[PDB]
Design a protein around this ligand. Structure first.
Ligand code: L9W
Length: 350
């Protein structure tokens, strides 16, 4: 990788999120979104390192702080859609062509730390909050499918979550140092999702009833000794990090235990490896994988970018000195974008 371009957003506030749109066809524009302050900005990647500013969404509330964004598509037209959330705990659905807000979802009792769309169902949106819960939404029928939390749920702010390859299960993590498994391929959850597609408030005077999931399918506090701020699936394995200068690769149960045989009472975990690095010991720093799950990237608090081939390289620039909060690979893995605390954007081309 070589640094081909850099720019700074006029708001001069930290950028906490970056996502390339992985739903665009070959020959169609290479687009990424950035989130910082009360803003969402779209950019296009052109040849010779050129970055073109497309459009910006400025929220009506000046005190809103966006922390996360995620792309999806309309199941009928295949047209792109962009979800955003942050400090106000309100999910906003944006039309990326006009950059106008289509609709919003109110419900979480505090800020939203992450948004993730289901890998097979573009209408299923997962949100994780400072209110100690996760929420699953159906954005086609505007319904709250389920709430994940309660007695055996997270005991502090939830920081991250990820669906597995097929979207049969979710792994969540947060300030309570725990990593929790939630199965969504159970008879209960499959019927709840089916019911959410049948609901229409105009054909009944009764509200839609959400599932209250009080108990996870697995839980551990034996991987990290501080806040767990990023979690991703790698097949049946889990990659997770704290502020302890390492990404840990692990699995529930003993070495030969199958993930779908794991019981909620499982007391063991198996450590399979660790990715070591330096000067990334502050809270709120995300790692990312490319679409192929062949590359892993993580930025540090002094502007250094670490890249590992999963089948270590350190990327530096004399003008890049601020903390890299999140990175994103283009679908073909030829471009890597990094966003920083000083509102700067960095483009690395393979
Ligand atoms: C410059 S400062 O004032 O020191 C500062 C620093 C961090 C935050 C902050 C960032 N991000 C989130 N949530 C999203 C999140 C969650 C997990 C990992 C992760 C991210 C974004 C990158 O990595 N926050 C929730 N509450 N505060 C924050 C706010 C102010």
């Amino acid at each position: 990788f070589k640094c081909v371009n850099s720019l700074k957003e006029d708001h001069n506030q930290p950028l906490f999120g970056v996502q390339f749109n992985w739903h665009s066809k070959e020959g169609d524009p290479l687009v990424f979104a950035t989130v910082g302050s009360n803003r969402v900005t779209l950019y296009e990647c052109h040849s010779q390192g050129e970055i073109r500013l497309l459009q910006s969404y400025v929220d009506a509330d000046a005190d809103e702080n966006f922390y996360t964004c995620a792309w999806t598509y309309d199941s009928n037209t295949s047209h792109p859609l962009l979800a955003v959330a942050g400090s106000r705990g309100i999910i906003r659905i944006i039309n990326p062509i006009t950059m106008q807000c289509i609709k919003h979802y109110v419900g979480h009792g505090n800020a939203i730390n992450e948004l993730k769309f289901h890998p097979r169902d573009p209408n299923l949106l997962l949100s994780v909050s400072k209110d100690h819960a996760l929420r699953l939404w159906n954005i086609q029928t505007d319904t709250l499918v389920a709430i994940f939390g309660g007695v055996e749920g997270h005991r502090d702010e939830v920081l991250s979550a990820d669906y597995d390859l097929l979207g049969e299960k979710i792994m969540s993590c947060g300030m309570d140092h725990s990593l929790k498994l939630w199965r969504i391929n159970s008879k209960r959850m499959m019927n709840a999702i089916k019911e959410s597609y049948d609901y229409n408030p105009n054909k009944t005077n009764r509200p839609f009833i959400s599932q209250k999931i009080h108990f996870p399918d697995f839980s551990t506090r034996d991987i990290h000794r501080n806040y767990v701020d990023c979690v991703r699936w790698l097949g049946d394995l889990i990659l997770s990090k704290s502020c302890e200068n390492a990404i840990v690769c692990w699995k529930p149960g003993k070495m030969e235990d199958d993930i779908d045989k794991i019981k909620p009472s499982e007391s063991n975990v198996t450590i399979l490896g660790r990715f070591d690095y330096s000067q990334c010991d502050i809270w709120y720093m995300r790692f990312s994988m490319d679409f192929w799950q062949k590359m892993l990237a993580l930025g540090n608090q002094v502007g250094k970018l670490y890249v590992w081939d999963l089948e270590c390289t350190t990327l530096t620039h004399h003008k890049c000195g601020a903390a890299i909060r999140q990175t994103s690979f283009s679908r073909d893995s030829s471009i890597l974008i990094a966003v920083c605390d000083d509102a700067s954007i960095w483009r690395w081309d393979r």
